[PDB]
Scaffold this active site. Structure first.
Site, mmCIF file in Angstrom:
data_model
loop_
_atom_site.group_PDB
_atom_site.id
_atom_site.type_symbol
_atom_site.label_atom_id
_atom_site.label_comp_id
_atom_site.label_asym_id
_atom_site.label_seq_id
_atom_site.Cartn_x
_atom_site.Cartn_y
_atom_site.Cartn_z
ATOM 1 N N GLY A 13 35.518 29.771 67.827
ATOM 2 C CA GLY A 13 36.916 29.889 67.443
ATOM 3 C C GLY A 13 37.051 29.675 65.954
ATOM 4 O O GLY A 13 36.312 28.871 65.385
ATOM 5 N N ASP A 116 53.576 26.964 58.334
ATOM 6 C CA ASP A 116 53.332 25.542 58.494
ATOM 7 C C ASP A 116 51.828 25.298 58.584
ATOM 8 O O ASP A 116 51.144 25.861 59.454
ATOM 9 C CB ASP A 116 54.049 24.994 59.732
#
Length: 252
Positions: A13, A116
């Site tokens: 990932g 963010d």
């Protein structure tokens, strides 16, 4: 096993890119990540991101069946590296912090839609360089940032927000890297949001005056009083052993 000039190795990932495949260039042996989609607009926006500490797009291949993005490889997460070690020196933390602040400053100067900063998007490559995964297309778990990194003005909604929210985020990251714990810690959401809105947290005494002082100016509740990214870059503590390539053009 093969795609264009690349030989597939294993799956991992990479932050907001999700599951990618580590691959070796078939001539140079360069490590690369392949993001396979089986989008046009999101690629164009990513093509714009050219900073040494933001994950780079190398190429896009059309498999007339799938689209494969060839992106920068970074097989570790920063917080993992921080955790899997003992308390790291102020100089190691600052080294990482300088890279992050520069990537943030870059994002502000160009007109890049604010994302963010999430802890899981802070990756590390083999040079021990921070690589920020900045991409936006898993989503059945949460749709928002970590509440622990959210600024008072966002949390309260009562105020409006800007580029000073990134200074609050970066201030939490800097605290985490130096102290190996979150500044705002609580297990209950409404309790956590009360401490964040009021600026209640402890600065450990093992911190230097420089580090404690910079944190303290980043974690200011009123965003109009919060230190700016540009002033962070001139801070006495920040500037120590700062590589020149991290500076914005006006400071070079």
């Amino acid at each position: 096993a093969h795609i264009g000039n690349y030989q597939i190795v294993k799956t991992l990932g990479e932050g907001s890119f999700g599951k990618v495949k580590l691959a070796y260039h078939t001539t140079t042996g360069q490590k690369v990540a392949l993001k396979i989609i089986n989008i046009e607009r999101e690629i164009s926006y990513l093509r714009l991101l050219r900073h040494p500490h933001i994950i780079k797009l190398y190429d896009v291949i059309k498999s007339k069946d799938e689209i494969i993005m060839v992106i920068e490889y970074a097989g570790n997460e920063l917080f993992d590296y921080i955790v899997q070690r003992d308390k790291m020196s102020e100089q190691e933390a600052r080294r990482f912090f300088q890279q992050i602040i520069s990537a943030v400053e870059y994002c502000h100067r160009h007109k890049i839609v604010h994302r963010d900063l999430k802890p899981e998007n802070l990756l590390l490559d083999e040079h021990l360089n921070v690589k920020i995964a900045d991409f936006g297309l898993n989503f059945l778990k949460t749709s928002c940032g970590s509440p622990n990194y959210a600024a008072p003005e966002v949390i309260s909604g009562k105020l409006y927000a800007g580029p000073e929210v990134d200074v609050w985020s970066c201030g939490v990251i800097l605290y985490v890297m130096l102290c190996r714990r979150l500044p705002f810690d609580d297990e209950s959401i409404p309790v956590l949001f009360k401490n964040i809105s009021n600026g209640v947290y402890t600065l450990p005494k093992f911190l230097s005056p420089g580090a404690a002082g910079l944190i303290k100016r980043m974690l200011i509740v009123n965003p109009l009083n919060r230190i700016s990214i540009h002033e962070i870059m001139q801070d006495d503590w920040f500037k120590v052993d700062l590589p020149e390539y991290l500076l914005p053009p006006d400071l070079k």
